[PDB]
Amino acid sequence: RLGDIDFTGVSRTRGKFVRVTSSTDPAEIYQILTKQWGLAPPHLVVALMGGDEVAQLKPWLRDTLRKGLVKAAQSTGAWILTSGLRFGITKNLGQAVRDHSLASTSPKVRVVAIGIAPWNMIQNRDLLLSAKPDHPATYPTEDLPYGAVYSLDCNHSHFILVDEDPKRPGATGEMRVKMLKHISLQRTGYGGTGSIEIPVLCLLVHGEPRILQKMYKNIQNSIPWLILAGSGGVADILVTLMDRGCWDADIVQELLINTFPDGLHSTEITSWTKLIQRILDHGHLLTVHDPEQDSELDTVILKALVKACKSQSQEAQDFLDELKLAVAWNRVDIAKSEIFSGDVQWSAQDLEEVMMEALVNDKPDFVRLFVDNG
Amino acid sequence: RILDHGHLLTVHDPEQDSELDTVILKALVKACKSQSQEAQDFLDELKLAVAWNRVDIAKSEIFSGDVQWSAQDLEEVMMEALVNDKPDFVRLFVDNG
Amino acid sequence: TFQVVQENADIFWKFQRYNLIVEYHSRPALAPPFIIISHITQALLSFIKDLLERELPSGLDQKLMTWETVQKENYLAKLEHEHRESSGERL
């Protein structure tokens, strides 16, 4: 089910898509993304897990988040996994991605916004149902209100239209989780010689209690999460719990009730409390991003990844991917503070490849650091 | 009984602050915040802050998390800030919905 | 007067050079007294029927507008960052 979309409206753009069922293997979709659509394996994957709630971010925080994400992503080739629906934070994030793409004087590195959207949420699905390979389907762009149905965003280059599973109404979440897990087990390069394991990272923006199960499943899959300090939903609960230092069942229940007065179900409240406790039990996979304080998303992403790697193991070869990513972002301070601090032994054979990468990509600070480190 | 209220009492230290307009605005916004949490209630204090170019005080007190702000609520205050040549408040309102 | 004027004279020369080049754009390539041939040809073409100031396709125009907006945002961000790191602001 491959087709092309020719969005018609203020800006005429061409976008690809593929229909898929929730029972498919994510390996096939990854292969079709890499080969059929010509997308190079990303050097960074940032998945959005929010912004579909009625309450939306303030324009200042929305702009700060989009600028930080685009600035972090533009160094390398990154993918931004969002629900390809023209609404909320997703619409503006796709707008920022397309604005960067148009203004990008270097097409070698490309920031691609992939859209994983449910088939039940698509407006005018019959219009794209034609999907003639010779003649791309014409799709009209309409800025619908919240409601329950949205239109495909024109700014998203590629789409993954998942069909709703008759078993449970969570097919899109399961597909997103499986896709993130599968992508996290790939190599960022064409060959496994100078390639890193793809850094998959999730971002939470004003989540609802319904997505707690998917978030915990992702955490079980061992992929880091970033929490906006001023998002508003479950993100506020998590940042308040982090500020507390410790989590208690009564405390989390009180915060959940205060933040979500509408939801009052004893079984649901208990399940969400248990899910939140189990999520906070990990901790090392959770990291808070405060745009009012830090406003440097790349630094926080690198810190979260290096924290996860350090929690995983102490071997030098394990830290290699994080060090290479730090090289690619000129974060010599972060690398010196985290990776090259006492605990990890560093041999010349271990550092030869990273030395090559820093030397080719014109990173003098990392060259100095590696020469000074063996 | 006077100290029992407290929110209606505010201290002005000319040796420390010496900015009477700031203290007046702080007292009024404190009283309004104690009164209620609705956006429409905060409207008069926001307009007065607009009239005094106290963008810092407004940002610190009125536009801090607690109060939701819709475009229809902010349209009149946007008009007032735009007519009276208050660019800081124009920037704040554009950034706030 | 030379010392005070020379620097402004250079800028004024550049500003006038723009207009002179604009004039030379539409000037016929034949110098006088030959120029009469070009004038007759132009009159005949008008009776029978630019590298500067060009009009671009919609897609390219939108791309350049977005690129201008991105560059403006970068320039403003640089100004703000330089303001934050200034000695007076730090003090």
UniProtKB/Swiss-Prot annotation, chain C:
Signal peptide: none annotated. Ca(2+) 2 binds at residue 23. It is found in: Cell membrane. Disulfide bonds: none annotated. Homotetramer. Belongs to the transient receptor (TC 1.A.4) family. LTrpC subfamily. TRPM5 sub-subfamily. Contains two Ca(2+)-binding sites that are allosterically coupled. The binding site in the intracellular domain modulates the voltage dependence and the accessibility of Ca(2+) in the transmembrane domain. Monovalent cation-selective ion channel activated by intracellular Ca(2+) in a voltage- and temperature-dependent manner. Mediates the transport of Na(+), K(+) and Cs(+) ions equally well. Activated directly by increase in intracellular Ca(2+), but is impermeable to it. The activation mechanism of TRPM5 involves a multistep process. This is Transient receptor potential cation channel subfamily M member 5. It comes from Danio rerio (Zebrafish). The lineage of its organism: Eukaryota, Metazoa, Chordata, Craniata, Vertebrata. The chain holds residues 972 to 1068 of 1165 of the full protein.
